[PDB]
Design a protein around this ligand. Structure first.
Ligand code: BCL
Ligand code: BCL
Ligand code: BCL
Ligand code: BCL
Ligand code: BCL
Ligand code: BCL
Ligand code: G2O
Ligand code: LMG
Ligand code: LMG
Ligand code: LHG
Ligand code: SF4
Ligand code: CA
Ligand code: CA
Lengths: 667, 50, 662
């Protein structure tokens, strides 16, 4: 009746809505519910760690062929060899012990995770009753553990988050000491301050246990004040800690990248190059079209090799396939992308809280420095403008250097590779942080700076212009939803001004500066777009710049080289197809086409209703829903970012192929 | 003096007068190598005097 | 109420609308077409100049270029150029090319002069001093007395006829041009270029006899006469688009025929020195000087300095490369002209729906689709057929690739290797297979899929059943949206539907590119050594080895793009231009506007207390309409500057069906 339809597209409208992906929004969660959710998720984390340990079994000591290699366990196998729970052992006898140890640790993780999940469930339901004693614990005022909960934290459980930092630090000191004693007792590894063995890990676990305990005492008796995070800790403290964890995670990725290449880490990562890996989905022993089983020996349709019966997964060496740095790059890039995403999400959730306090006037009611700074509307403009100017300068300089390098490679306009930026290396005072310092590393540093500033532009726009901007201050407008996609074509268009869309743009902009890491950690010569290509002079880089290594290929030729192995395997090929499929579908929701989709969905609804009557019968009242531009942007950011980083994984997991033999000039 | 030493060591530390956004500029210039931050600190510490 | 229509109009004074039909009359259109044809003759002349290889006075000529290599088979067909390996014959070929280029310059100067002289409405003969009335004139003198007895065309429906006899005169004049200048007496032997002269005379007779009928019995289409600037232009533009698609198909079928072998197949028998191809690469310490090779000997002992290295026409199947270039150029131009004709027709349709004379139309071409329920049924059946065909063909492709890669333990014997076209359709193809069936169904799917947007343009130019039930109407044909209302109204104008039709036909046209390159669109992997993609030629019993699959098409046939500097530069520029379109297609215009105001305040802040004086300049941001226009051009150009690299890098579709790896 034209109104029954109207309260159908008045159901996805980007007003304030339920938004199923916000059921666990911190606004409706209290402190104890957060504790319980984190405990349950840590229990599930223990469950999946046990699953990974099970996937690490190769002999099943009770007697059976084991699991094939997989990235889920290959990314942690060096750690388990470091802890002595797994082995790089060539013999079944020492591998049965590793299987037994992994099975026992998986069972232990299952038990501990079940306990942790049950505790988190009881915290989630506000049910801290001890079934053995029948009493009930008080979340607001509890003794921590007992006598230990009285000598330190003399009763008086923390009532505020700034008052909870200290007991948390003491809890983390307990964690460090517990891990140290677990090392010392279960895993051997007595604490020796020899910073070249795993014993140093136990020693530094005890050192950090002492440090964290003292710091927790100090912050228990002298709580610090960020002030504002105490009130809306659901979003303020949560987002600040999220961006802090993002920076910590980027730092951890850098630590992993530096450490896993050191000689002290050789028996755990570099020794992966002496192994042979049988990965799921890799090229299997193929057979002809007329295989008739009857094992022991093939009769009709001889397979590729007489060995590896039927459809066995073919071996691949760890030296040609650089599994050492493949695993290193997987771990490092995982933690780097997670850190970048956590920084972006912390800025976004902080902008959410900050718009919430700008809407109710609490923004002017903040006393802490962290907002009294940006409550200026000019220091906001100055900061964003100087970030944009620095991003413009760095990005323009580095991109023009890259384009000139590519021109000199291809000899466009009759140029030559000696006209390129082969001389532009890091300073000798900066050459210590690179191996084989060249224009590639200079370009990497400047591309990292440019991409970080490019994403920082949108991060600053989230931080400052959550509710209003100098443009929207000059106009008679204000932002009051953090998720509204637009106000319309007025002023030529107002698309994507909310902090959610600014988050999406920050993610898309950081895609470049983050994939630049994938090129780098794979050694892919981002200093030019066509490297190693035999066009004019791209193979002369190794001689003109006196390179010591030989990186894979330039930015564009990186999709030709090392894709020879993505295509060579079925699993990586189907991942490539799925990633590209997911990625381009984001155009259906980022392109300014939502109303076209709504109109076409109305047409399809009328068609299906009519097609359900001309041929079928009965009412066809079902109608096609269209994702609104808020939902369209959310789904599009997910589709785009996942589509690109399901294939950055393919670049990372297809091999290293960054040989240390600089090829001679073409001459 | 003390402020010149602070600028050479921690250029943001010497430059706390100027602004809420200028201090980020000095700090990030210090992040890039160490010379840009020191140069900015000396430039804006000799600007109110000279 | 006539003011209201002018009041409620979007700004139509944009830089890409200065030559709009609504602000031109008949004679300015004549002048514009005449000047454009003069510049076109100038372009043909410069192409012929680029066709010289021996420079009749005696000198090395032009290196081969795609602009001239496209027309070289035709120029040889007319005898102006030759596939001769001796220098003396190329002397005459270059002399003929130079003479024809000079003739083109002369005729183009005359024709540009005429285009200017019509554009200014001053048709006065400079010698005898008389004038010429555009609305009433004698065509050529006694010719305009024997036919069109004193009078002239008062309307386009009365101009079809004189136009038809003008085209008959063009055919006849081309007949005498061939017969006299080029030899080629008109013989009804449809195996040589004599048949073209004979059919030129036949067409001259036919269009003459048809123009007489259309002058004596003018046709009745009515509505293309009143708002004749846009309605007739759009109808003729979509007709020319379909004609261009047909001509591309004609070229594809004909250029592989044995009769066209002396002009196209002989391209494989020559070596080509294309511009920008790998030259004689040189070492670092080269000094050339007078002794040539004093230090740092170059890549080849011959080919001095940086000479462009030869390229074989056999491995690089430039016969098929040139055929693909011409065919795909005409096909993409035809599809674009069809889309643009539907778009400009929707412009006229919204114009006549706004002013209320939509229901005053009597032609079936309007009344048939003026029901708002017949429109729904047509669009719904188009969407249903599109969904069915595309679901079937895409699931077939995905299943073929799954059976290739042996996902879920599947085997290539489970794939659609048996789904060839029916024998009554196998004459349409050489070596019919799943590739040809998938190609036909992909063409149907893409054509219907872009036809969805075309039909929405043709029907929902002013209102749609959804917007009827809402309190909304379309009145701009270029407006992007009505804001976040109803959850969003993005991209509902006919301009936006035209953009969607273009982006949707991008897939169905890349299908054409990959089929005419023999790139096995039947599956996403082929010739890749994963599980079974190299076993297609054996199980499917193929007589050809297609280049690769859909996804593997970017690895193979790119080894040659990379090996040349020019193709790599085109690749990089196309990718850059393509992804730049995201900055304007994404729902981000307001973000760009806010950021640009930040840029303005920064540039004026940095220029006021660090520089001096006002910095009044402010950064402009393309509006959503401008953003979508620029993004569609960036996307379409970025993809079809590299579809060119597909076409112009070799055929590599050898006839050796890759025995299975066992
Ligand atoms: C690694 C250990 C997990 C944890 C795992 C569990 C598990 C498991 C259980 C409890 C249970 C309880 N925990 Mg506890 N609990 C954690 C942290 C907390 C915190 C906090 C940080 O503020 C609080 C207030 C509580 C409070 C409570 C009481 C409601 C209750 C019994 C206390 C006890 O016996 O002594 N737990 C630590 C982090 N807790 C027990 C319970 O609820 O009994 C009904 C229960 O089964
Ligand atoms: C909530 C308001 C209190 C607060 C008290 C705590 C407490 C208590 C803890 C953290 C925790 C964290 N805080 Mg806090 N936090 C505050 C102010 C800050 C500031 C700042 C002002 O710049 C920063 C960068 C951080 C950052 C951090 C991370 C380093 C750390 C881990 C977060 C996570 O895993 O979850 N907090 C203020 C003082 N923060 C956790 C931590 O790691 O402690 C060692 C933790 O247990
Ligand atoms: C280093 C660890 C990260 C972290 C990583 C995660 C991850 C990952 C998840 C949560 C999840 C949750 N976290 Mg946590 N979380 C951290 C610190 C916090 C802080 C804080 C400092 O104030 C808060 C309030 C929360 C609150 C929450 C709730 C949104 C939710 C738990 C309940 C649930 O439904 O299940 N986290 C730190 C910063 N948190 C779960 C969730 O649903 O989030 C929507 C989830 O998947
Ligand atoms: C002056 C000519 C080049 C230039 C030449 C160098 C050189 C030379 C070096 C850097 C290096 C650095 N430059 Mg630079 N760099 C330029 C322009 C810039 C700009 C800018 C806004 O324009 C910025 C922010 C930077 C920033 C930086 C960091 C990316 C990097 C390491 C600094 C550090 O402390 O750590 N460069 C100009 C275009 N840059 C140092 C480095 O380590 O690079 C790896 C280094 O040795
Ligand atoms: C291919 C030839 C071009 C063309 C090329 C020229 C050129 C060149 C000239 C004219 C000029 C004239 N043309 Mg004429 N002209 C064309 C089509 C037309 C049409 C039409 C389609 O209705 C009309 C009405 C005219 C009418 C005229 C008069 C304005 C004028 C002198 C008449 C003549 O020379 O005899 N031309 C054809 C399409 N015409 C001449 C003129 O205006 O002199 C002042 C002039 O210089
Ligand atoms: C404008 C109003 C007149 C008209 C008179 C003419 C005249 C006169 C001519 C065309 C021309 C064209 N018309 Mg018209 N045209 C009309 C009706 C139609 C209809 C229809 C009803 O379906 C169609 C499909 C077309 C389509 C076309 C193409 C057949 C042809 C080439 C266009 C171009 O080059 O410019 N016209 C009505 C009857 N049309 C040109 C052509 O080539 O005709 C052979 C041409 O000279
Ligand atoms: C994967 C590619 C795409 C489609 C598949 C598709 C399908 C589709 N689109 Mg689309 N689209 C883009 C991509 C795709 N758009 C892009 C990249 C842009 C940005 C330029 C874009 C833009 C617009 C605009 C502007 C409009 C639409 C529509 C419209 C609908 C038409 C309805 C119809 O006739 O049926 C046609 C529908 C089909 C043939 C679907 C059949 C399945 C098949 C087997 C493909 C499988 C789908 C997928 C690959 C697998 C995932 C499944 C999952 C389980 C893993 C129809 C659902 C329109 C409407 O919604 O209404 C008309 C509309 O207005 N779009
Ligand atoms: C914002 C301002 C940031 C300024 C800080 C300067 C940036 C320095 C980056 C260059 C450092 C570098 O190249 O490391 C140099 C080191 C090693 O340097 C060379 O690197 C080579 C890689 O091919 C090899 O490892 C060689 O052994 C080694 O010599 O590289 C790393 O391994 C770094 C780890 C990956 C870096 C991740 C950066 C995360 C940034 C995310 C930003 C996304 C947005
Ligand atoms: C709308 C409904 C359309 C229904 C018509 C069905 C479409 C049939 C197309 C497949 C037939 C075909 O390709 O011919 C088959 C013929 C020849 O068929 C085989 O083709 C092979 C190519 O690998 C070789 O040429 C072989 O010699 C030949 O056997 O192919 C062509 O050369 C046709 C030219 C390309 C035609 C593209 C049409 C352009 C449409 C663009 C629209 C996009 C929007
Ligand atoms: C008879 C008329 C025709 C009737 C039938 C026609 C309709 C049939 C259509 C069915 C299939 C539709 C074609 C596809 C439709 C299509 O391609 O358009 C995308 C589509 C949005 O479509 P709209 O809602 O605009 O319109 C589609 C309409 O057909 C009905 O909604 O959905 C998405 O945005 C997908 C994201 C869902 C959320 C997923 C987010 C990401 C999750 C994680 C996945 C990635 C992992 C991370 C990697 C980065
Ligand atoms: S194009 Fe879409 S997102 Fe942008 S202003 Fe219009 S309705 Fe809003
Ligand atoms: Ca890699
Ligand atoms: Ca080709």
């Amino acid at each position: 009746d034209a109104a029954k339809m109207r309260r159908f597209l008045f159901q996805r409208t980007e007003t304030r809505s339920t938004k199923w992906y916000q059921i666990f929004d911190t606004e409706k969660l209290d402190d104890e519910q957060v504790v319980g959710g984190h405990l349950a998720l840590l229990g599930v984390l223990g469950f999946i760690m046990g699953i990974y340990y099970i996937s690490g079994i190769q002999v099943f000591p009770w007697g059976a062929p084991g699991f094939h290699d997989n990235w889920f366990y290959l990314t942690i196998k060096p750690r388990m060899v470091s802890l002595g729970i797994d082995t790089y052992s060539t013999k079944t006898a020492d591998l049965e012990a590793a299987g037994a140890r992994l099975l026992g640790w998986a069972a232990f993780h299952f038990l501990v995770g079940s306990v942790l999940i049950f505790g988190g469930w009881r915290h989630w339901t506000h049910n801290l009753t001890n079934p053995f004693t029948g009493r009930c614990g008080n979340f607001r005022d509890f003794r921590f553990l007992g006598k230990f909960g009285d000598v330190v934290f003399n009763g008086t459980s923390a009532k505020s988050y700034k008052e909870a930092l200290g007991p948390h630090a003491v809890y983390m000191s307990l964690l460090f000491l517990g891990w140290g004693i677990v090392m010392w007792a279960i895993l051997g590894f007595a604490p020796i301050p020899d910073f070249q063995t795993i014993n140093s890990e136990t020693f530094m676990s005890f050192v950090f246990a002492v440090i964290f305990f003292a710091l927790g005492i100090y912050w228990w008796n002298n709580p610090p004040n960020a002030a504002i995070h105490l009130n809306d800790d659901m979003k303020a403290a949560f987002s600040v800690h999220l961006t802090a964890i993002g920076y910590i995670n980027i730092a951890l990725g850098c630590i992993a990248f530096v450490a896993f290449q050191q000689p002290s880490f050789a028996p755990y990562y570099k020794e992966l190059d002496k192994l042979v890996f049988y990965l799921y989905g890799e090229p299997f022993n193929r057979v002809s079209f007329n295989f008739v089983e009857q094992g022991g020996k093939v009769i009709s349709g001889a397979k590729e090799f007489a060995d590896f019966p039927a459809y066995a997964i073919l071996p691949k060496s760890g030296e040609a396939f650089g599994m050492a740095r493949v695993v290193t790059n997987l771990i490092v890039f995982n933690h780097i992308i997670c850190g970048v995403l956590y920084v972006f999400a912390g800025v976004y959730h902080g902008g959410q809280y900050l718009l919430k306090i700008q809407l109710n006037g609490m923004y002017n009611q903040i006393k802490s420095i962290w907002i009294t700074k940006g409550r200026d509307q000019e220091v906001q403009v100055k900061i964003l403008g100087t970030v944009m100017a620095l991003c413009f300068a760095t990005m323009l300089s580095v991109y023009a250097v890259i384009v000139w390098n590519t021109i000199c490679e291809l000899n466009i306009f009759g140029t030559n590779i000696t006209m390129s930026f082969y001389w532009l290396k890091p300073l000798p005072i900066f050459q210590w942080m690179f191996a084989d310092p060249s224009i590639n590393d200079w370009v990497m540093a400047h591309v990292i700076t440019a991409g970080s500033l490019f994403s920082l532009i949108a991060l600053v726009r989230i931080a400052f212009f959550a509710h209003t901007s100098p443009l929207w201050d000059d106009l008679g407008l204000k932002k009051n939803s953090y998720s509204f996609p637009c106000l319309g074509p007025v002023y030529g268009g107002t698309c994507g001004v909310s902090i959610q869309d600014q988050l999406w743009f920050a993610m898309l902009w950081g895609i470049k500066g983050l994939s630049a890491v994938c090129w780098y950690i794979d050694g892919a010569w981002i200093a030019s777009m066509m490297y190693g290509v035999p066009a004019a002079d791209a193979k002369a880089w190794d001689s003109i710049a006196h390179l010591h290594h030989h990186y894979t290929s330039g930015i564009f030729y990186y999709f030709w080289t090392e894709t020879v192995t993505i295509f060579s395997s079925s699993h990586l090929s189907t991942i490539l197809m799925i990633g590209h499929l997911v990625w381009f579908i984001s155009f259906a929701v980022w392109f300014e086409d939502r109303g076209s989709r709504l109109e076409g969905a109305d047409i399809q609804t009328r068609t299906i209703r009519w097609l359900g009557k001309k041929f079928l019968n009965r009412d066809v009242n079902f109608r096609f829903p269209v994702l609104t531009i808020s939902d369209s942007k959310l789904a599009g950011t997910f589709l785009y970012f996942g589509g690109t980083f399901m294939l950055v994984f393919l670049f990372l997991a297809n091999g290293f192929y960054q040989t240390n033999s600089p090829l001679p000039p073409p001459v | 003096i003390r402020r010149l030493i602070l600028a050479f060591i921690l250029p943001p530390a010497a430059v706390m007068n100027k602004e809420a956004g200028t201090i980020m500029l000095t700090g990030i210039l210090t992040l890039w190598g160490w010379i840009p931050g020191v140069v900015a600190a000396l430039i804006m510490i000799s600007k109110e005097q000279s």
